[PDB]
Amino acid sequence: STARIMLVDDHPIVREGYRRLIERRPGYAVVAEAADAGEAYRLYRETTPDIVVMDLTLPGPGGIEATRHIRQWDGAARILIFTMHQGSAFALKAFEAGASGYVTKSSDPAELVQAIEAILAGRRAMSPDIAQEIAEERVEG
Template identity: 60%
Template sequence: MATTILLVDDHPVVREGYRRLIERQPGLVVVAEAENAAMAYSHYKAHAPDLVILDLSLPGPSGIEAIRHIRQWDGSARIVVFSMRTGAMIARQAFAAGASGYVSKASPPRELLSAVATVLRGERAMSADIARAIAQDEVAGGRTALDDLSPRELEILGLTAGGMTAQAVAEALCLSLKTVHNNLSVIRATLGARTDAHLVWIAIGAGLVSPSEELALKEP
C-alpha cells in the first residue's frame, strides 16, 4: 500500500514542488495539503497520513504549535520539519514538540527523501547542517536564556519577533490580550531585553525566526 503524506507550507508553489518531488518516488502519495497550523491539525485528523512534512514558518501559530497539537492527538505521528531555519535552538524545540526529523530547505532534495525514509523506519533524521548546528551548540555549552522560557513563551516570542502585534498573537493562540502582555513581560525579564526590537534580534540569533521573517521591527 502507498505511504500517505500531508504537506504543510503556506506557499502553494512550494507545496507543488514538494508534491512533484515526493510523488516521483515509488509508493509515496500526497493525500492532503495545509497552509497553516489549524488546517494541518484538521487534515491530520481527517486523513490520518503516515507522515507529515511541515514548515515552521506559518501564518499565525507556528509549525511548532502544529507539531504539538498533532502529537497530542496522535502520539505516534511521524513529522519531518522542512524549514529555512537552521538554528540549534529551534531544531531542539521542534524535536521536543514531537518532530521525528528536521531538514533545512538549503539541503539537496535527496536529504529530504532520505529523512522521509529514515523516519518511516521509526528512526530520527536530520540533514547534515542541522546535525552540525546541534553538535556545535552542544560543544559550546548548549544552554542559553531561551532555555528558561516555557514552550508557550517561546511561541509568543517567535510570533512577536515575526512582526505580529500582541492583539494578533492573542487571537492566533486563543489567549487573552492580558495573558500575552504578561508573557511578554516575563520574556523580556528572562532575556534581559530592553525593547521589542531587542527581542527580535535575540529571536533571530537563536534561530526562532529568520531575518527575512522580521516584518515590523528594526535593529535596536
C-alpha cells in the same frame, strides 16, 4: 515499501514543487495539502497520514505549535519539520515538541525524501547542516 503524506506549507507553488519531488520516490503519495496549522490538524484527523511534512513558519501558529497539537491528539504522530530557518535553537524545540525530523530547505534536495524515508523507518531525521550545528554546540557546551 508504501506511504501516504500530508504537506503543510503556505507557499502554494513551492508546495507543489515539493509534492512532485516527494512523489518521484514511488510508493509515496502526497495525500492532503494544508496551508496553515488549523487546516493541518483538521486534515490529520481525517486522513491520519503516515507522516506529515511542515514548515516551521506558518501564517498563524507554526510547525512547532502545530506539532504539539497533533501529538496531543496522536502521540505516535510522525512529523518532519522542513524549513528554511536553521540553528540548533529551533530544531531542539521542534524535537522537544515531538517532531521526528528537522530538515533544511537549502540542504541538498535529496534530503527531503531520505528524511521522510528514515522517519518511516523509525529513525530521527536531521539534515547535515543541523546535525553539525547541534553537535557543534554540544562540543562547546
